[PDB]
Every structure is written in structure tokens, then in C-alpha cells.
Amino acid sequence: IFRTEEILKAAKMPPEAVHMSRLIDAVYFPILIILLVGTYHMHFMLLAGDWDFWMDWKDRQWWPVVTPIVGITYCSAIMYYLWVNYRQPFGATLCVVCLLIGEWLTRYWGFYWWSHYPINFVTPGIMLPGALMLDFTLYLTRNWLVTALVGGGFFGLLFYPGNWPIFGPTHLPIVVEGTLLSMADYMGHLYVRTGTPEYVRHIEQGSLRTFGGHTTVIAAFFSAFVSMLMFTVWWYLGKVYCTAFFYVKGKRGRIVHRNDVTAFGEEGFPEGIK
Amino acid sequence: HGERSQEPFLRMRTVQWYDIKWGPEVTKVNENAKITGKFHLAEDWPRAAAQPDFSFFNVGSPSPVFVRLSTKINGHPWFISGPLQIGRDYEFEVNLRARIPGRHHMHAMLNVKDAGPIAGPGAWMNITGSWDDFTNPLKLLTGETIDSETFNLSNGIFWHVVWMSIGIFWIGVFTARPMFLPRSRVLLAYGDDLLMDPMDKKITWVLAILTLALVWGGYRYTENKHPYTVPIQAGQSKVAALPVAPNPVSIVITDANYDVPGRALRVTMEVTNNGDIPVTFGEFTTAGIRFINSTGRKYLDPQYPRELIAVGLNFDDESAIQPGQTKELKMEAKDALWEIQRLMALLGDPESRFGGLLMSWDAEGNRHINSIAGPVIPVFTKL
Amino acid sequence: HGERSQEPFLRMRTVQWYDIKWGPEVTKVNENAKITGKFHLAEDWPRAAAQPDFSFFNVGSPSPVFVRLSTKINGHPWFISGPLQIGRDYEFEVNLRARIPGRHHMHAMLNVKDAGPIAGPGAWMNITGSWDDFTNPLKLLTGETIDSETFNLSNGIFWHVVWMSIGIFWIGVFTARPMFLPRSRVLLAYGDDLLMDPMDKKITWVLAILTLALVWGGYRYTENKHPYTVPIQAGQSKVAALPVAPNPVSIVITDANYDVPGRALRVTMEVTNNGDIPVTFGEFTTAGIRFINSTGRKYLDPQYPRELIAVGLNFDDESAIQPGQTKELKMEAKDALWEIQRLMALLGDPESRFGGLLMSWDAEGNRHINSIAGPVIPVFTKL
Numbered sequence A: 001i002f003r004t005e006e007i008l009k010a011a012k013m014p015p016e017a018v019h020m021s022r023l024i025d026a027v028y029f030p031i032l033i034i035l036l037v038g039t040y041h042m043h044f045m046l047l048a049g050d051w052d053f054w055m056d057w058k059d060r061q062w063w064p065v066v067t068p069i070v071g072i073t074y075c076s077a078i079m080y081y082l083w084v085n086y087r088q089p090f091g092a093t094l095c096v097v098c099l100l101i102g103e104w105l106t107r108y109w110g111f112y113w114w115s116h117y118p119i120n121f122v123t124p125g126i127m128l129p130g131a132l133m134l135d136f137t138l139y140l141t142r143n144w145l146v147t148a149l150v151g152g153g154f155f156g157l158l159f160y161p162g163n164w165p166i167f168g169p170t171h172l173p174i175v176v177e178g179t180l181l182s183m184a185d186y187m188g189h190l191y192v193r194t195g196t197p198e199y200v201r202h203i204e205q206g207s208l209r210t211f212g213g214h215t216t217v218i219a220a221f222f223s224a225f226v227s228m229l230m231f232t233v234w235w236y237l238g239k240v241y242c243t244a245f246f247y248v249k250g251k252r253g254r255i256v257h258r259n260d261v262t263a264f265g266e267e268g269f270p271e272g273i274k
Numbered sequence B, C: 001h002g003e004r005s006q007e008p009f010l011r012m013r014t015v016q017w018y019d020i021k022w023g024p025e026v027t028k029v030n031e032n033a034k035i036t037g038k039f040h041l042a043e044d045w046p047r048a049a050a051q052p053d054f055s056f057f058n059v060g061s062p063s064p065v066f067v068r069l070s071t072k073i074n075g076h077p078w079f080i081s082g083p084l085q086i087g088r089d090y091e092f093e094v095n096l097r098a099r100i101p102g103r104h105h106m107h108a109m110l111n112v113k114d115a116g117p118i119a120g121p122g123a124w125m126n127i128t129g130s131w132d133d134f135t136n137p138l139k140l141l142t143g144e145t146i147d148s149e150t151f152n153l154s155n156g157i158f159w160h161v162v163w164m165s166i167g168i169f170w171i172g173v174f175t176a177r178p179m180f181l182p183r184s185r186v187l188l189a190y191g192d193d194l195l196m197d198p199m200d201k202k203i204t205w206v207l208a209i210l211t212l213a214l215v216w217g218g219y220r221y222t223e224n225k226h227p228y229t230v231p232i233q234a235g236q237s238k239v240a241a242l243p244v245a246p247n248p249v250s251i252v253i254t255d256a257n258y259d260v261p262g263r264a265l266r267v268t269m270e271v272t273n274n275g276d277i278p279v280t281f282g283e284f285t286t287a288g289i290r291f292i293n294s295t296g297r298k299y300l301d302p303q304y305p306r307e308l309i310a311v312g313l314n315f316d317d318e319s320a321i322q323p324g325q326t327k328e329l330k331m332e333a334k335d336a337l338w339e340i341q342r343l344m345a346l347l348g349d350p351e352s353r354f355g356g357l358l359m360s361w362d363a364e365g366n367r368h369i370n371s372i373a374g375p376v377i378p379v380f381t382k383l
């Protein structure tokens, strides 16, 4: 219903070759999924996992700025790989889905079932709408620079509105011992973190140069701007990550870079197959 | 559980805890509990430990087996960390509620901004019941009753499931056809003309419209359901320290030594009772460890954990210092409790120094506390 | 003009200005003017605002319509910023001279090193005359009279014109002949042999000699015309704070709430008059805004701007606190002035806290000032 038979006919694959290709896909794609889970999860948690773990770290200054900048990195590289090599537009969504799968597994088994923290206190939460819109921008524009601009803007801007339905109810006010707190703050105080005291929270604190009514908005744009840079940089990193050569040697013992080329991609190879 | 690893000189000369009460010993789930105490910030604050300009009073629980209902330093709610003064005494009270059954060692700690955790004494508390019977009913300022254990649980899971389903559909609409090798061959031999599908364009447009509409709709629904919300609270807590109590006892440390192949702390001091009533020393406290004699045993909490109490406090002259008299005393704190808490580890410290609280009592029962510190010399008994 | 944007909790608990006099109201160009006042640094200094270890007293003018002849904190010339103490009171006097005619709102500000600007109250001052009649005659230590408006004006313009003429000649000696395309073709086809001109070498040598000679000559001429010069002054200013006045009134804040859909500040306090004469509260001051009652109206500057004065201070018991009596009072500061200065914006603050100055008077007219602060709770009248 898509155009798969035409693609297979253009590739000149006999039925056994088609079955072998299907087996290659079924073997390699789960491997890529697991690698994305592991590596992207490590990168995200060790760069932005602290705001990710706890409800009271989700603030208006650092969370919506740090999170998208860290998240765009693997997404840009994987999108480069998929789009450039196979014309597949689901890179960023796949990255964020893998990250969320790993995050949910660790929160349920590590934080909750081992450390006895409640599940609602460790919602990560989502970063998916921005990745989806970035994928849609890359597919519709087909240009990676226009994709950098527009998709990075979307990725940096849609983070806070997309997470507001999850963490908005946690901002309801409570009064404890005559002191006003957000419900996330009282959840953080209620469930003791022996290794995490209050003063380590890198959250907003207000300033005499600060417009309290615009804070998130400013954080929504700065995180966007850097994203437009970061994407671009990591897009070039994708070209570094796709570098596939061999160190061959001969005679004097000299080492030369050698590239294995696809024979089907040559000038007259497809016509001579028949 | 780890406090002994902490270098002695540091803990010994940082926070000097005293009068710590844990109770009740055995409590059922959903019942109230309290940890109360006082602590003195030693004047000989080590250079390694930073000044307590941002101090948070924490609980050293095995896990959140207790929900910290409140923490109050002196009388000020200590939800936000704040500065504390060195050489001043403070009182703390932690109100908790039983969550997870079991036997658990429950400590006092003072987390300092750059110094780190300063753990305190510990006692075993028992919770009897079931974790599935735990309820923590709270009331919000907007006028809604909630349960802290189950709050905003279905909302987050629901939004996660919705967005993850959308993402899974987007991913799997492409993982249903030849995806790696035939596409690579076609692209490397014929370009991307056959690799672009109008049906994929229609799906992309529909999904982009759906994503933007869902973001806007969720934001508007949340802002209509909860019109009033407060941001994440921050700032600092501030409380005046306990007033300095008049001390008729003045102590000057002249010598101090500790056995390297042994367990003993020998301190030579010059004490002056410039008051008007005889005064007798009865207790030396450091790192929660207490060395007591008959005088100290006379005024002793019968419910304090006995694993941190050692009757090993000896003086050369165990007589009451008469008013207006200066006396040279030699105190000897010797018991196996020094080996458990590793007084032995002062030989590898970059600062060989001791500190603690020496407690004395009047004939009428009034208590005086002196924070004593000095340099300790190693004594090699093996030689 | 911008102070209302500044978060309330911050300004409310930083600098508490009081007794501010602007005058004369209408002054001609080249005449003297003065802004005097006092300010208290609140003990509840917010964590967001850094400590005033480098404080400069500035003037919030629309433009330099006034030339700041001098600024003196207490009695020390405050040309260089310096440290100020929290919990202490200071007096300031700014002497200015009229420069630009018009109507201008003239403020007091205290710029703190890392906190930023802390703007104060403002009043409208009028200047009548002409900006072209402005003269500021000063006398230098070397013994020369100058005008600050026209000083070192012809010298800088002259040297700029000379060097810019030399640079323009150097540039334009080459922008008079084929310069981009023929040179590129000749260089890319034949090398640079035909692109080097001996006349250009002669011009280059002459101009280099002229440039070096001009640099040396200008330096020597300036060092011969002004043998004595001082560098750019730096350092810090230092003045002792005003002595702490004895206060017979001690106030402890127990509760405080503010209406979110409204305008009101309700503060519950426990007041103690440990003096020997009845004391009656009359004024609550914060962020320059003043709430007064009959007692406060009795002692009121008739020339203070009326746009920051609100007769809305109400007590449950408006009776004088007798000596040696502790009383529970509930103060209610309600007026539209809360909406103008945005007391409303405490709901989006990461620290919901109020602060201000409560003023009280004796039967004989002596004034006591108390800096009060606490946590404010939002009250949702819409519910």
C-alpha cells in the first residue's frame, strides 16, 4: 500500500535476497534500539538526569533549558545516519522512545521497587512532541539546515508546554507549618533523600534583573536557540560517526585508508546484472 | 552506617550532637514519630569542612520508610536550607510518619553546602504493619484533599502512554517494509526519487497537525483545570541560635595523646571554676559516642541507645572543682568503642586533632557544656 | 519607572528607604538641588539578592538632566563603591546641579555588586531654562579653571581629525586606480612583479616616518604640557553605620496573608512595649509605599509625593500599647496602591515573603522603627 514492490524491483533482489534482507533488518534493528537505549540513556542521565529524577527539580530556568539541549544531540546524529544512509525519517522519535523505555525500566525497578520511592515522584517525563515535530520538519523540508532552524526551534519551544499536563498539577500550593510550598516541594521534603539535600537543587531563585512573568518564555527561546546550533554541530558529528574505512598495509609496511564500496551503486553495474 | 569511615578529626570538630531522643520505639504504619535533639557547631571547625552557610537538616534512613512530615531547627520550619553559626547551639525536631515496616537505624544528619554530610547518632526503630496500608492525606491551599503516595500518578502515566503510542506508531509505520538494504541500494544507484512516498507525506502532515493540536489542547486543559499554581519554592531559612548559656567552667587544653596500637584518649586540661558552686565533670561526648562516669550516669537518658554509651571516663582527681579554683586534670576515655568508631584512624589524617563536648554538673543538678579541642599526639605502644 | 517589575519579595526585604526629601521642586539651570534620605538594610535580606559588599548610591534620572556634584553616605564622600552592613541604617545626601530643562522623575537607588539595582521612591522635579546656558565651572588641583560640559573637547576632535585624515589619505591613494579585477587577473596570470610600485614604496616610507614622528611628538607635547597627572582612581569607600537606636517595641510576626484576586496585606503580629511610655503604631512603609493612619498623618512630610501615600492602615485595636504589655495585633494595609506596585505578583515568586518598616510614635512624638518580615500566604477570594 506504500510502494515496496517497486523499491524491491529497483533494487534487483531475488526472493532469497529479499528474505535475507528481511532477516538483516530483523537482526540489526533491535540491536540499534538497544544501543540507543543504553548509550542515549547514559548520556541523558549523566548530563541532565538530576532534573529528570525528581519532581521538585522541574523548574522554569534550568530544566526546560538543559533538557532539550542534551536531548537534541543523539537525535541529530541518529537522524543524520538514518536519513543519509536509508532515507528514514524516524530518528529523533526513535531516540526519545528508547530513552523513555530505559528511563521507565530503571524508575520502576531501581527507584521504586528497590529504593521505595513512589512512581509519581519520579516521572521523567516526556520529550516526544519536539522529536516528532523535528522528524516531520526533516521529512517535509528535505533540507537539513532549514530542518536545523525550524526543528530546533520546535524542539526548544515545545518542551515546557508538552510537559505542563504532567507536572502542572504538581504546582498546586500547600501550607505546611505556616509556610507556602509547591506540592512538588512538599513531595521532595516528605520522601527523604539521604544523598540529595535541598541546597543542591539547580532551580530558579529570582533576581533583581528578572521578569517573573516571562521566565519560562525566555527559557523557551534560549533553549531553542542553542538547539539550532547543537543540531547543526551534531549533524556534522553524524558524518564523523559514519566514517567507515580500513587501515590496510602492504610492502614497506605502509598503512593506507581504504573504503569498501557498494558495487550496485556504480555507473553501469545495475544494467549488467541482467 | 558509614559515619566511622568519615575521618575522625572532621566529625569530632564539626557538629557536636547532644540530648537526642527517638520515639516511639515501635510504631504502626500511618502513625506519628519524632526525632528530637540539639547540636553545637564547634568553634574548632576543621578547614577541610566548609563553613555551614547552607545547612540542611536531613534524616539518615535506610530508605523512605518514614515520610518527613516536618523538620524544625529551633522553631523555624527548615524546608529550605540556610546558614548556621559556628560556636552556637541549635535545637532540632523532625516529625515523621511510618511508611514501611521493618527495623531501621535512624540518624540525624546536617548536610553542609561544600563540606558534605555530617552524620550523627543512630537508634533502631521498628515499624509494624503493611506498606499497602500507608495513606498520607494532605489538604491543598486550593481546597482539595490528596494522598501523597498516589498523587498525579494516573495523569503522568496517561500522558506518557498517549505520547509513547503516537511515537510507536510513527516508528512502526516504517518498520513494516524493506528498510535497510534495498533502500541503501536504491539510493546509491538511483537517487531518492523512488524512496519518497506520498502516503508517507500524508501521514506526516496528519501526525504533525495532531501533535501541535495535542500540545495546545493539553496545555489549555491543564491551565483551565488548575488556574492557580505556585512555582518551585526556593530561598533560604533563617533562625536565631540558642542564647549563649553562662559557663562557670573555663578549660584550656595543654596536652592530648592517643594510642596507635590500642584504644585510649588521654587529654590534659586546666579547668577553672570561676562560679560560686562546686562543679564535677561527668561526661565526654564526641561523634555521638558518650563516655560517662558515676556523675554522668546519674543524669543519663534511660532510653538512649546503649551501643554508643561507654562507662570509661576516668580522671586523676575525681573531685568537684571548688569555686574559684584552677586545677590540672587528666581525662582518660578508654573503651572498645574507640575501636568501633575508629579513633585508630588519626594516624593517616592530614590533621591530627581531637574535639568533643565535656559535660559537668552542679551539686543541684545544673549542667554545663564545654567544647574542647586540640592536637593529639600518637603513642606507639608497640614501639 | 521599572521598580514595579522588580519582584516584590526582593525589594520589600532589601533596602528600606525612609525620610526622603527632594528639593527644590522647581529650579533654574545652573542652580543647586538636593536629594536627601535614609535607608535601612533589612535583616531578612533575600537569598536572591547578594550581600551589599560593594554598594554604590546612584540616581535614577531619565538622563543626565542633573550633574551629580556630590554623593555622601552618612558623611563620607561616596565616589567609590563600598560595603554596607545588613540590619544597619544609613543616611544619604546627593548634591546636584540643574542641566536640562523639563519635568523629570528623580529616584534614589542602591546598586549592589551582584544583586543589581534597588530603585527607590520617586518625585517629579522641574528645571526651567536652556541647556545651552549650562556651565559647570570647576577648578583643578594644578590651578586651572575648566568647564565640565566643554573640557578636552577640541583636543580629542583635533587628534581624531588629524589621524583620520592620515588614514583617509593612505586608503585613498590606492582607491584611485583599477583595484579589484585587473589586479586579480595580473596576479593570477603573471605574479606580483607588475603589482609592486616604487612610488607606493616611497609613500609608505614617508608615511611610516611621519606616523612614528607624530606619535613621539604628540606624546612629548602632552607630557610637557601636563607634567603632573594622577591615574584613574579606584579602591573602596568606608563609613560607620548610624548607631542602633534603642527600640522599646519588639514585634514577632505570627501570620501574614495577601489576597490574590484583590488588594490587601494582612499581617498578624505580637507586639511588646518593654519601655516606660505608651506607644501607638502609625505607618507601614515598604518599597517607598507608605500606609498611614491618623497617628502617621500627624507626623507626615507635607512635601512627600502623594502618589506613594495611602491612608489605608487599619488595626483591630487602634490603641496605644501600654508599657510592659504584650498585645496581639492584626494590621491591614489595603488600597489600590497595592495594585499599582504589584503586590499581586507574589504568586509567581519563588519565595513568597513580605517585608517592610512599621513605624510607631510616643505620646511626646518620638519615633520607633521596626523592620518586620515573614511568609505571606495567598488567599484566593474567587475560590
Ligand SMILES: [Cu+2]
Pocket (backbone or CB within 6 Å): B001, B105, B106, B107, B122
Ligand atoms: Cu546507621
Ligand SMILES: [Cu+2]
Pocket (backbone or CB within 6 Å): C001, C105, C106, C107, C122
Ligand atoms: Cu520614575
